[PDB]
Design a protein around this ligand. Sequence first.
Ligand code: HEM
Ligand SMILES: CC1(C)[C@@H]2CC[C@@]1(C)C(=S)C2
Length: 405
Amino acid sequence: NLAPLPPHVPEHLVFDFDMYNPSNLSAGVQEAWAVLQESNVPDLVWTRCNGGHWIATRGQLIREAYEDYRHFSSECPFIPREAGEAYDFIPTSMDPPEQRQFRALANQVVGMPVVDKLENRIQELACSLIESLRPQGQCNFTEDYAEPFPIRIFMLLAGLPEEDIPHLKYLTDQMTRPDGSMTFAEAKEALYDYLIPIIEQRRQKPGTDAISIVANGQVNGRPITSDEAKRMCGLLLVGGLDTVVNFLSFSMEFLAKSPEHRQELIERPERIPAACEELLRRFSLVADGRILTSDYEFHGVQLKKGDQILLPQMLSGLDERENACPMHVDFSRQKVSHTTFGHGSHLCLGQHLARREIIVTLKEWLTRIPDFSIAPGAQIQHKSGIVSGVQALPLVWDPATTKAV
Ligand code: HEM
Ligand SMILES: CC1(C)[C@@H]2CC[C@@]1(C)C(=S)C2
């Protein structure tokens, strides 16, 4: 289902990439995207899929576009347009200067100082989940760790019942990796139905949780509105539920396949932080975009007002112009160049949280379960979307090679 080419699009710029179902998905999600970076592909292409939109393919262009909010607006950041249109998260669907006030508040809730305070729980949960798995000699890493670990921490931060996970996780998934079961607006609405009563409750009787702080916050000298609080919280939920979860699975799949990388981390732990960056580069997984505010000629291509453009954060670090041998995992790269957590004014506020969760997992897993692999005859399937993911990750190990702590 290709959309008819608009008049302004030169036929030579056409490359029919489906962000939701790329062609070489079997080879892995990052590799399926990386087709965009082959020599036969222009830097800036138009795809007829998902209603027609531009895609910048090179880290240089992606960064420029991300910097330029005047031309590339966040108003409609999701493809397809109906999703971008329904999209009303804060701060994400706002441009500076307006964005700034909302960002400052979101920052109060997820930033460094929160990470620092939660550090002990993160460590406690990771150790507990791992120890609980260790003697089994097998899990479903996606269901058994990648989900619970980051989610439970978010749940704790947000002061929401663990019981809500399944319902919430379903709705968030619908947003990044649409099933066809529900449209964006429907999904958005169901999440909002969820949050409304809670926000209400927390404006009346505040707690110390993230929702309480957002609901009762100050933006541009006045109080946040209920609707504004709803729209921030909605974003927080998607970030909490859908990011760290998927990343861990890519990373753990790689480690399961690469003894020499595991060993490296076991023997030279000083390297963890560097490896975490390298994994964030190689297993980058986010792709959103912007909307043209006006007619604009960008690197010799004429963009029309209202045109959406995908600026895949995933792609920058995979670009050979940015990193030599991109598909190769090297913990000792002199410079790890990525835009995994975004670029420009929308840089990921939850990054500090994400990094802490990753580093803990690496350290803690490797400590107890140094030797593991993918289950014999399991085929690992990746899934593409706004946030890419791994369907299931069956791991096996010999308990006798594990270490209790
Ligand atoms: C592996 C982990 C994650 C990755 C790769 C990631 C990636 C991103 C990207 C690419 C953006 C910018 C999007 C844009 O420019 O359209 C961003 C923004 C954002 N993310 Fe993260 N994210 C992660 C984890 C999280 C977590 C754990 C949270 C906390 C709930 C979260 C909260 C946010 C917020 C609040 C923003 C918006 C900042 C603003 O618009 O000013 N992220 N994320
Ligand atoms: C990856 C996303 C595009 C999705 C919606 C905003 C975003 C930056 C976070 S955090 C979740």
